[PDB]
């Protein structure tokens, strides 16, 4: 008894370092279509700092941040996701210029939808990157893109007026992409009652403030998530 | 102030200095009555001599009178052999003032019933707390810390009661206890929003480290400047019971005891203003949620000091003194009571937990 | 043609069930009802693992019945003591997301395995006496939900690819392939004689296979959504199952059909674990109402219900001898119940 | 068996109409959210409609926003797409999809290659 | 201010100061 | 899916061809194994203290 004793309190010690270890490091779920540029921001953070699970390391002002894409799984998510509630927040990466798959957008957005009413990520938070900014403005401005025949709604849009547009950013281009997160945010806001947030934003695939956009938006939700044990939320 | 012992010493004096006075048609003959020096006494003439400088409630202006006879011995009142006086002059400053005694009994009640209901619904927060080990939370470790400064301030200040009001070390000591548990509730007060703004603005957290920080600081700087104003006050006055001011020794105690609220409430606007800020990234159910979290916030961050923090220390016979002191009294004492019920008892998770407990036991 | 060999599945899938309706005069309730009622089975908490710092998603007794191996969510395989609630092996994994876990029925080895698509075996008897990665079994192209040993050199294992494995240590070899699953295979559990195994998937199906020959030998209908447990009855000739539509299900080998259904108005939440007593008298599922429900398993009656945990409750496991149940969940606490 | 045959689907002239049905068995219809999904030929599936359980709630993708009109009756177990104004688009196979988990608002994977609670599908050809 | 410890010595003064005034008072009656 | 379409068939051959006992039969071996096993299971049933080894 007195060496399983020894062996435990060696056990503990170490389970206590591991404990030390294991809450300062921040866990993320990358999700999305492959087409999105998921991938793109993979290799963009990992340069920056078979497998069924590709882990990603990198650290924001000396935060460690664990990123976790699910690779060579099959398109049925349903029961692989649930592992991934307790992560700070899923990474999702829209194709936001791939309407007209016949509709991927329709197809994000009906993943998103699932994903935010599922009942396990209910209270865990989305990164939402409308990964295709670069291709939505040359679409929209070739007059290629017709959103109004996918899209009804988009007849009789108007931008809403707290919408900042980038700089030297034709009229359209904002109307359309800002449409898009409007129904990404119509999905979010019904029924979201604040145990859980969504982050949209207009991102490409080789931007460099996508790593400092996660680490903003997952201080965020960690102080939203400490305001809620003070019931101040 | 000049007690009862330093005016008898005081009038030993002017005994003494009377008596080597006197030992250095017919005059009376000089003689001491206790309260002044008499020089001769013109015959068949009334002598008036001012009012003694030695005693301090006795109007200098005025003057005591007394007979002398024209055989060289004082007059004396009709009917008894005590010798003729007329000190009315000296006490027309004297006022019964049961005003005073009637409102320091009144803050004495009203505190009392205050502290009474804080001490009570603390005991049950914090044994609700200490009970239940799912809420066993750095957060509620430093919520049972603040609860248990809550409770040590009510009994310290009914054993002071008790002690004092009803110099010997039994009283020195029941004092100290006081002021050192005041400090430490003040500082726990501190330490409750100095975490909260950590975890805001801090939200990577280092948890091992910074609860014992916290710890030792709530517990021991109130301790150090407790001890710095018992050496100072053991050095320099030693005298009576602590009850008494001594200049601004008091201020080793008060200066460092005011800093912290005047920090707390940085903190708690600074942390209003984040809330804001969070509802703002998110009508009318925006400003009503964010009235309601500064509602509830405000007892736990000791808010209503920063009203009358600031106030010197008033002649008690005036209408600042009473607000501050009827104000202050109440609110001091149902801080304790408000924070218990809003942060134990309208918690959430700990509502929770009472519901599934007592599902439990009657199943 | 495809439409000819659609007409002939038609048919023969209205065949089958002709033959399973044929069988079914007599139902168990007409047949237990000469069983009296278990009553309330008032179970309390007599042990609280504590060191799981995530979500518990598998645990597995040992034949000792006092050991048992517990994956965390946080990268951690912990082996307790159960009787003194000592830890005796603390294996960190190489990848937290781990989804189940066993231990050898000879006690030298235990198994995990989760999103990874790897098995990874360590050994608990090294020289040394320290816990090392003793071998690796890749081949899965689907996230690995379950794994049972059937000896220290033979494990079975099944993914969600929608196919079961299984494997030989010594050589790392898929010994044997096991498919026609349409949905990912979520557990597994072997036969007291080992020489068969029912797995459940997620499509609403369940399938016994013979172990030697690879074959599906029999597939059971019935649930209306996944299936995210199973296991055998303790005779060997019957097996129980937990879904996603809140009802689990008690299957007869030899009946090629349903026996039993269990599930409630109040219920509606799906099992996520489920374990026969060594009676089987009792079925403990677990439910993602943080709960776990006691069942009598012969009059479908509830007879008790496992209140305590904070979280959803992830797996259940009975002891060899019966002695103890542990429920892990996913507040990351094991709780031992007799 | 979760069982889903769906059947009124054939040939019809550009802006024609017609029905689709969707005869369900071996679930409770009115406990499970459905979909329509169509997989037009060299696409995969596309979602089209959803409809909640008791038929309050409803979607649609914008292509077929004011043109198909989806419903169910519960009574019945059947769920029916009514098709106006067609288009030389809408030739695809229609299966009537069933998403796995009762009474949650979540409905995970309708539009997966090899989905199970989806049924064979109706050739449209417009 | 701190407000209980300035009670302290207000309630402290005011009850050595009425001690003083009823021995002051009753040492002025008793010679007036 | 021709290939999918044939083992599926064949399958389902398979289970046709396969003999079934009466459920009757099925559910009097469980009831007979059961009440053959009940009093070795310490949770259907109370055990004293001195043999419970969680006690």
Same mark, same amino acid.
């Given at each position: ?39 793109? &921001? ?8 078979? !497998? ?43 194709? !936001? ?82 449409? &898009? ?6 999905? !979010?806001?019904? !029924? ?18 996508? &790593? ?22 | ?47 008036? *001599? ?23 011995? $004082? ?37 009392? *019933? +205050? ?96 609860? $014992? ?6 517990? +021991? ?25 001594? +200049? ?54 000791? *808010? ?31 801080? +304790? ?27 | #043609?495809?439409?000819? @060999? ?74 307790? %003591? ?68 059937? %000896? ?31 949905? %990912? ?10 020489? @068969? ?26 649930? #209306? ?32 059909? #349903? ?22 008298? @009792? @079925? ?55 | ?126 | ?32 | ?55």
């Amino acid at each position: 008894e007195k060496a399983q004793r020894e062996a435990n309190k060696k056990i503990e010690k170490q389970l206590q370092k591991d404990k030390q270890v294991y809450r300062a490091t921040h866990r993320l779920l990358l999700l999305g279509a492959g087409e999105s540029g998921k991938n793109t &921001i993979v290799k963009q953070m990992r340069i920056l700092h078979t !497998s069924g699970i590709f882990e990603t390391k990198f650290q924001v002002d000396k935060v460690n941040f664990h990123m976790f894409d699910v690779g060579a799984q099959r398109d049925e998510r349903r029961k692989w996701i649930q592992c991934f509630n307790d992560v700070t927040a899923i990474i999702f990466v829209v194709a !936001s210029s791939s309407y007209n798959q016949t509709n991927r957008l329709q197809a994000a957005l009906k993943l998103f939808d699932s994903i935010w009413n599922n009942k396990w990520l209910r209270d865990t938070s989305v990164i939402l990157f409308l990964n295709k900014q670069d291709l939505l403005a040359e679409k929209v401005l070739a007059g290629k893109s017709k959103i109004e025949d996918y899209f009804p709604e988009f007849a009789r849009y108007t931008t809403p007026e707290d919408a900042t547009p980038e700089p030297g950013e034709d009229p359209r281009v904002t109307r359309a992409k800002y449409f &898009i997160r409007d129904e990404f945010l119509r999905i !979010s806001t019904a !029924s979201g009652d604040g145990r859980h947030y969504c982050y949209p934003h207009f991102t490409c695939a080789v931007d460099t403030e996508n &790593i400092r956009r996660v680490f903003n938006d997952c201080r965020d939700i960690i102080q939203r998530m400490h305001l809620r044990q003070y019931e101040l939320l | 102030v000049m007690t009862k012992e330093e005016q008898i010493f005081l009038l030993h004096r002017a005994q003494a200095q009377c008596e080597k006075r006197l030992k250095e048609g017919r005059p009376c003959l000089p003689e001491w009555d206790h309260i002044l020096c008499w020089p001769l006494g013109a015959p068949g003439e009334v002598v008036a *001599v001012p009012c003694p400088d030695y005693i301090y409630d006795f109007n200098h202006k005025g003057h005591a009178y007394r007979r002398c006879d024209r055989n060289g011995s $004082w007059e004396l009142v009709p009917g008894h052999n005590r010798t003729w006086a007329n000190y009315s002059e000296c006490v027309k400053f004297l006022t019964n003032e049961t005003r005073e005694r009637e409102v320091f009994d009144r803050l004495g009640m009203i505190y009392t *019933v +205050g502290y009474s209901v804080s001490l009570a619904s603390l005991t049950v927060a914090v044994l609700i707390l200490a009970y239940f080990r799912r809420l066993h939370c750095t957060r509620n470790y430093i919520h049972m810390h603040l609860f248990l400064s809550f409770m040590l301030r009510a009994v310290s200040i009914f054993v002071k009661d008790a002690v004092l009001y009803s110099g010997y070390a039994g009283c020195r000591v029941a004092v100290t206890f006081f002021l050192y548990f005041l400090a430490t509730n003040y500082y726990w007060i501190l330490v409750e929003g100095l975490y909260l703004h950590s975890l805001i603005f801090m939200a990577f957290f280092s948890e091992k480290k910074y609860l $014992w920080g916290f710890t030792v600081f709530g517990w +021991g700087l109130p301790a150090v400047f407790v001890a710095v104003w018992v050496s100072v006050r053991a050095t320099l006055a030693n005298t009576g019971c602590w009850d008494l001011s001594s +200049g601004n020794k008091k201020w080793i105690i008060q200066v460092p005891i005011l800093a912290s609220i005047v920090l707390n409430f940085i903190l708690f606007i600074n942390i209003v203003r984040v809330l804001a800020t969070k509802l703002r990234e998110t009508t009318r159910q925006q400003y009503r949620k964010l009235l309601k979290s500064t509602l509830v916030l405000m007892p736990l961050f000791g *808010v209503h000091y920063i009203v009358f923090m600031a106030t010197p220390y008033t002649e008690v016979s005036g209408t600042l003194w009473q607000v501050q002191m009827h104000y202050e009294m109440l609110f001091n004492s149902f801080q +304790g009571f408000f924070v218990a019920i809003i942060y134990c008892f309208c918690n959430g998770e700990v509502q929770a937990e009472i519901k599934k407990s007592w599902s439990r036991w009657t199943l | #043609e495809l439409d000819q @060999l659609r007409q002939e599945a038609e048919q023969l899938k209205n065949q089958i069930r002709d033959a399973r309706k044929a069988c079914a005069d007599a139902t168990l309730s007409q047949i237990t009802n000469n069983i009296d009622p278990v009553g309330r089975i008032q179970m309390r908490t007599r042990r609280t693992l504590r060191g799981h710092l995530a979500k518990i998603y598998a645990m597995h007794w040992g034949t000792d019945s006092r050991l048992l191996v517990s994956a965390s969510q946080d990268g951690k395989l912990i082996i307790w %003591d159960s009787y003194t609630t000592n830890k005796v092996h603390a294996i960190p994994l190489r990848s937290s997301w781990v989804m189940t876990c066993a231990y050898a029925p000879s006690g030298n080895y235990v198994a995990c395995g989760g999103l990874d698509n790897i098995c990874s075996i360590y050994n608990l008897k090294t020289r040394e006496g320290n816990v090392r990665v003793s071998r690796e079994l890749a081949g899965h192209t689907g996230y690995l939900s379950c794994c049972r040993f059937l %000896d220290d050199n033979q494990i079975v294992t099944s993914s969600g690819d929608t196919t079961c494995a299984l494997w030989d240590i010594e050589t790392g070899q898929q010994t044997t392939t096991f498919t026609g699953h349409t949905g %990912d295979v979520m557990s597994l559990s072997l036969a007291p004689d080992t020489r @068969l195994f029912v797995s459940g998937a997620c499509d609403a199906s369940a399938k016994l296979w013979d172990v030697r020959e690879g074959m599906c030998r029999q597939t059971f209908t019935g649930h #209306e959504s996944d299936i995210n447990a199973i296991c055998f009855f303790p005779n060997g000739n019957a097996f129980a199952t937990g879904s996603d539509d809140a009802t689990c299900r008690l299957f007869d080998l030899r009946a090629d059909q #349903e026996l039993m259904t269990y599930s409630h108005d109040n219920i509606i939440c799906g099992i996520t674990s489920v374990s026969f007593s060594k009676s089987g008298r @009792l @079925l403990l599922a677990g439910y993602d109402d943080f709960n776990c429900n006691v069942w009598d398993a012969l009059k479908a009656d509830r007879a008790g219900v496992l209140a305590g945990h904070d979280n959803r409750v992830s797996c259940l496991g009975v002891t060899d001898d019966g002695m103890a149940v542990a429920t892990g969940s996913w507040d990351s606490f094991l709780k031992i119940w007799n | 068996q979760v069982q889903l045959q769906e059947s009124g689907g054939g040939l019809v002239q550009p802006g024609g109409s017609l029905r689709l049905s969707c005869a369900a068995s071996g679930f409770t219809f009115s406990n499970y959210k459905m979909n329509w999904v169509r997989q037009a030929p060299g696409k995969g599936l596309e979602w089209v409609s959803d409809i909640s359980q008791s038929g309050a709630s409803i979607s649609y993708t914008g292509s077929v926003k004011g043109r198909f009109t989806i419903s169910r009756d519960n009574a019945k177990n059947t769920l029916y797409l009514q098709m106006n104004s067609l288009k030389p688009e809408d030739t695809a196979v229609y299966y009537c999809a069933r998403c796995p988990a009762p009474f949650t608002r979540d409905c995970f994977d309708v539009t997966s290659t090899t989905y199970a609670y989806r049924g064979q599908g109706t050739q449209v050809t417009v | 201010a701190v407000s209980e410890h300035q009670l302290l010595h207000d309630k402290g003064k005011s009850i050595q100061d009425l001690r003083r005034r009823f021995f002051l008072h009753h040492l002025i009656a008793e010679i007036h | 899916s021709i290939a999918q379409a044939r083992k599926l068939v064949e399958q389902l051959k398979m289970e046709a061809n396969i003999d079934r006992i009466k459920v009757s039969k099925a559910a009097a071996d469980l009831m007979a194994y059961c009440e053959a096993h009940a009093k070795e299971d310490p949770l259907l049933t109370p055990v004293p203290a001195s043999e419970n080894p969680f006690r």
